[PDB]
Structures are given as structure tokens and as C-alpha cells.
């Protein structure tokens, strides 16, 4: 019912956006908690969260299908 996907990107350190953490239900809520604790942007994107969850594992860099949408997610998150 509830998904959260945590992406990490730092220029010159992560070659691509990295899914560092994922969570469903209780752990999804925890992540969206902890993201508010540390002031990390949370964006609701149902199709992107669901496809990332189904395709990209924890600890895995995003694949080619996700480059454009995650680029846009990150730009939107940047400011905010």
C-alpha cells in the first residue's frame, strides 16, 4: 500500500543516482519520517515510486529507463 524509495546522487561520487534505501508500509512511513527529520525532499510520484520499487533493488544504481525521470525528480527536489 505504501512505498518509499531513497535516492542518493553526488556529482563525481555516485556515477548515477543510487537507490540507497527502500521501504514498504511501516518502513516506508519510517523513511518519510526520517526524511522530514533530516530535511530531505519528499515528492509523491506514484508511477515512478512503483516502477523503481519493482525494478531497482536497495544498493543498486538506476538503469537507463529511469535516467530521464529521475533527472527531473532530482531537479525538482533541488529547489524546492
Amino acid at each position: 500500500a505504501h512505498i518509499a524509495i531513497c535516492l542518493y546522487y553526488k556529482l563525481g561520487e555516485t556515477p548515477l543516482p543510487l537507490v540507497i534505501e527502500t521501504g514498504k508500509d511501516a518502513k516506508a512511513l519510517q523513511i518519510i519520517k526520517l526524511a522530514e527529520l533530516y530535511d530531505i525532499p519528499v515528492i509523491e510520484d506514484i508511477p515512478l515510486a512503483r516502477s523503481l520499487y519493482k525494478n531497482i533493488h536497495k544498493g543498486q544504481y538506476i538503469t537507463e529507463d529511469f535516467f530521464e525521470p529521475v533527472a527531473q525528480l532530482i531537479r525538482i527536489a533541488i529547489d524546492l
Partner: peptide, 24 residues
């Protein structure tokens, strides 16, 4: 070919360095 950076720390710390969280 799949690409991983599989070792990492705690749930709290991973989030604190995170860039964006996407949810449904």
C-alpha cells in the same frame, strides 16, 4: 549490466545523506 554499491550503513544515516525520497 547491473551496477551496485552494496555496502552501506544504517537506515538513519542513508536517509540523512539522501538527495530525494519518492513515494507513492
Amino acid at each position: 549490466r547491473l551496477h551496485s554499491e552494496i555496502q552501506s550503513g544504517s537506515l538513519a544515516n542513508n536517509i540523512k545523506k539522501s538527495t530525494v525520497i519518492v513515494k507513492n
